[PDB]
Amino acid sequence: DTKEQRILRYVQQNAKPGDPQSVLEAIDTYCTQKEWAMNVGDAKGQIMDAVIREYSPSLVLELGAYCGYSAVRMARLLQPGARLLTMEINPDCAAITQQMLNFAGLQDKVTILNGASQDLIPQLKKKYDVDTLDMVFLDHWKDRYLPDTLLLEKCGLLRKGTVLLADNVIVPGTPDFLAYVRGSSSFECTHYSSYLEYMKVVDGLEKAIYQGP
Ligand SMILES: Nc1ncnc2c1ncn2[C@@H]1O[C@H](CSCC[C@H](N)C(=O)O)[C@@H](O)[C@H]1O
Ligand SMILES: O=c1[nH]cnc2c(O)cc(-c3ccc(F)cc3)cc12
Ligand SMILES: [Cl-]
Ligand SMILES: [Mg+2]
Numbered sequence: 531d532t533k534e535q536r537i538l539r540y541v542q543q544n545a546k547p548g549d550p551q552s553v554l555e556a557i558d559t560y561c562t563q564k565e566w567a568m569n570v571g572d573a574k575g576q577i578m579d580a581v582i583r584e585y586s587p588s589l590v591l592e593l594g595a596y597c598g599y600s601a602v603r604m605a606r607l608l609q610p611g612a613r614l615l616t617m618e619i620n621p622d623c624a625a626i627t628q629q630m631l632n633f634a635g636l637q638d639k640v641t642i643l644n645g646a647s648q649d650l651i652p653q654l655k656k657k658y659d660v661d662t663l664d665m666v667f668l669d670h671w672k673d674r675y676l677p678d679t680l681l682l683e684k685c686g687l688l689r690k691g692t693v694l695l696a697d698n699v700i701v702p703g704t705p706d707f708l709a710y711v712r713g714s715s716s717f718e719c720t721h722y723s724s725y726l727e728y729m730k731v732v733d734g735l736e737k738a739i740y741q742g743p
Contacts, residue, residue: 550606571727587664594670598630
């Protein structure tokens with residue numbers, strides 16, 4: 531079996547069904563004591579929780595699901611009837627994420643879309659009945675962050691106040707995306723310095739709030 535399958539099985543055997551916080555703790559314990567994995571983790575996750583609670587977004591888009599850690603982390607703090615869509619290119623990972631959300635009791639709040647972000651984004655309005663997004667979590671692949679931000683804008687999915695939250699802007703790093711948002715009048719940017727998941731290595735989140743054309 532794969533690392534991701536082992537993480538899910540660990541959850542299943544060391545967390546409580548229906549209890550999101552127990553799911554996060556189990557994933558964090560496994561990835562600290564057994565095998566590292568690229569979940570946003572607890573240090574950055576606490577900054578993410580702070581953001582979610584500030585904005586209480588009704589519709590969140592996540593780019594990059596992996597095993598579902600971040601989807602559990604966000605979806606557990608959404609208000610009733612609020613929703614998360616998450617896009618995942620790797621079908622094995624999509625199936626793990628679904629099972630993770632199911633285990634957590636969050637499946638009614640989350641839709642996992644199996645496909646590439648750049649193919650799915652153009653289908654959100656007509657196929658997923660989306661108007662505009664309240665928040666975007668970018669956490670898929672460093673080289674897609676800029677192109678997919680620009681695509682989201684093109685497709686009319688951002689509105690004044692939409693919150694872009696970007697993982698890994700330091701490690702692996704996303705220099706094109708950062709230089710672009712920081713230098714654009716269309717974005718109000720703040721940097722949240724932290725650590726790479728499970729590691730004593732500096733990393734951070736970028737918050738970029740869309741301000742209109
Ligand atoms: N273009 C793309 N579209 C969708 N998913 C992508 C993608 N490029 C990479 N990915 C997916 O992005 C994920 C990065 S890891 C995501 C971690 C997750 N947000 C968490 O914190 O728990 C991987 O599962 C990878 O398959
Ligand atoms: O590719 C990644 N996508 C999404 N999130 C990531 C993430 O949080 C960490 C890393 C990562 C960081 C250091 C390293 F040595 C190897 C991989 C990659 C991704
Ligand atoms: Cl951590
Ligand atoms: Mg990440």
